[PDB]
Amino acid sequence: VQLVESGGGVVQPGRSLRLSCAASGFTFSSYGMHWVRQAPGKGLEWVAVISYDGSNKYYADSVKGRFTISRDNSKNTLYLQMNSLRAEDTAVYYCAKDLGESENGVVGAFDIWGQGTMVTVSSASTKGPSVFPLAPSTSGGTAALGCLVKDYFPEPVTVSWNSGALTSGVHTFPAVLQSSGLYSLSSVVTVPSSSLGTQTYICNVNHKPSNTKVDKKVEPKS
């Protein structure tokens, strides 16, 4: 059995998008089909359902109005016609089979799932990264500094420190999808709390797509 989603890309809120799920390795015409979404990095959220025939159709309240799950048994494809997309509909949509078993629709058990196509709804063009200094406070004998790479878009950002001359003590966290349809991540360096005043520290952020190369000297306060 194989489920292969399709038609997953970036979209502006309000506009439309229809995901396609090429199903194979089974009948499809005799199993109900589900759609499930998993926003990074939250849990599984049950989206919509369509019966084996296409009669019964059910959605979540967070989706009730604006989505219309359909399906094409001729092509063995499930369709999630998503209209009027919003921000918190951004998720990894999952084509999921239903397990209708044991004789005399249908039921809620998903034996097989698809790879899942990521939909990133965002009213946003390529935004350059705004970088902010995470000036230390410190929990002896160690202190922490960093750079909040925020309000950037899209997503490949590369951060370094001291132009490559600082690999150890460093930890760059994953990017998060913000409440502005942009992104945010932080870069951190863990150093001796005694070395603060002397050593200069620069986060060398580099958003390649938008062509921005931000550099922020991080130091403590007063």
Nearer to another protein by C-beta: 61 or 74? 61
- Give the Cα separation of 197 and 193 in Å (integer): 9
With binding defined as CB under 8 A, does residue 40 bind another protein? yes
- Give the Cα separation of 144 and 188 in Å (integer): 7
Q: Which of 51, 113, 162, 219 binds another protein (CB under 8 A)?
A: 113
Contact, 209 vs 193, CB < 8 A?
no
With binding defined as CB under 8 A, does residue 196 bind another protein? no
Q: Which of 66, 81, 110, 206 binds another protein (CB under 8 A)?
A: 110
- Give the Cα separation of 79 and 76 in Å (integer): 10
Contact, 4 vs 19, CB < 8 A?
no
With binding defined as CB under 8 A, does residue 107 bind another protein? yes
- Give the Cα separation of 144 and 217 in Å (integer): 14
Nearer to another protein by C-beta: 15 or 97? 97
With binding defined as CB under 8 A, does residue 23 bind another protein? no
Nearer to another protein by C-beta: 10 or 135? 135
Nearer to another protein by C-beta: 17 or 189? 189
Residue 82, phi then psi, degrees to nearest 5: -100, 110
Q: 3-state SS string over 118-142?
A: EEEECCCCCECCEEEEECCCCECCE
Which of these ranges, 21-29, 45-53, 118-126, 205-213, lies near another protein under the rule CB under 8 A? 45-53
Residue 202, phi then psi, degrees to nearest 5: -125, 130
End-to-end CA, the chain = 63
With binding defined as CB under 8 A, does residue 94 bind another protein? yes
Which of these ranges, 119-127, 153-161, 178-186, 194-202, lies near another protein under the rule CB under 8 A? 178-186
With binding defined as CB under 8 A, does residue 25 bind another protein? no
Count residues contacting another protein (CB under 8 A)? 49
Nearer to another protein by C-beta: 134 or 166? 134
With binding defined as CB under 8 A, does residue 146 bind another protein? yes
Which of these ranges, 10-18, 22-30, 80-88, 148-156, lies near another protein under the rule CB under 8 A? 148-156
With binding defined as CB under 8 A, does residue 188 bind another protein? yes
The footprint of another protein on residues 48-77 (CB under 8 A) is 48-49, 58
Encoded tokens for 95: 């084509």
Contacts with 100 (C-beta within 8 Å, 6 or more apart), sequence order:
30, 31, 32, 52, 106, 107
